[PDB]
Design a protein that fits this description.
The PDB classes it as hydrolase. The entry lists the keywords Helix-beta-helix sandwich, dequbiquitination, cytosol. This protein has 186 residues and is an alpha/beta fold. 24% of the residues lie in helices and 32% in strands. The structure holds zinc ion (2 copies). The site of one zinc ion (ZN) has 5 residues, from loops.
Length: 186
């Protein structure tokens, strides 16, 4: 059987195929930062084939980090790389070096732009010290709207209501044996 995933507003979501080794590959690549209690992020890049998305490239962008944040600092090299290799942005991945697997306030704000651009966009959060991981998205439309309208100050400000959820597997995301390459732009 095939599961057809839909948003909370009833819009169809195209399947994203995620190489099943990507999470482990990401952890091993960013390991030095993880030991120093610094987050690292990566971009999930790939292509649309027939009517489904395939993540084929794990791109580690030029970035800045703390124990609680990470973010791209040179969009240019990232942009030019994706343009040159004809890659779509399908989501992003990051670590919580010591904490549990959840989406923080800043994570929700980060993810909003991804999911506005691509309704299927996903956020993978790795919590290596807990040996846990999760794949998340905002509720659409309700969670997206909450974050879009939010102008509250502070990196850790709370939000009212349910805003995010785990993605449907295997309907929205399915982990499979497939090709992958790492591109470290640092
Ligand atoms: Zn986070
Ligand atoms: Zn907010």
């Amino acid at each position: 059987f095939k599961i057809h995933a839909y948003t909370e507003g009833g819009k169809p979501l195209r399947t994203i195929y995620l190489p099943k080794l990507l999470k482990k590959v990401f952890l091993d690549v960013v390991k030095p930062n993880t030991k120093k209690n610094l987050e690292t992020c990566g971009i999930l890049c790939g292509k649309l084939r027939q009517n489904a998305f395939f993540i084929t490239h794990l791109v580690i962008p030029l970035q800045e980090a703390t124990s609680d944040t990470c973010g791209t600092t040179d969009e240019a090299s990232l942009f030019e790389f994706q343009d040159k290799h004809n890659l779509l942005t399908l989501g992003w991945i990051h670590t919580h070096p010591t904490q549990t697997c959840f989406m923080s306030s800043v994570d929700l704000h980060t993810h909003c732009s991804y999911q506005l651009m691509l309704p299927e966009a996903i956020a993978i959060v790795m919590a290596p010290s807990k040996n846990t991981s999760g794949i998340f998205r905002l509720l659409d439309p309700e969670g997206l709207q909450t974050i879009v309208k939010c102008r509250k100050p502070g990196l850790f400000h709370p939000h009212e209501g349910k805003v995010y959820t785990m993605v449907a597997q295997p309907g929205h995301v399915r982990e499979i044996n497939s090709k992958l390459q790492v591109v470290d732009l640092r």
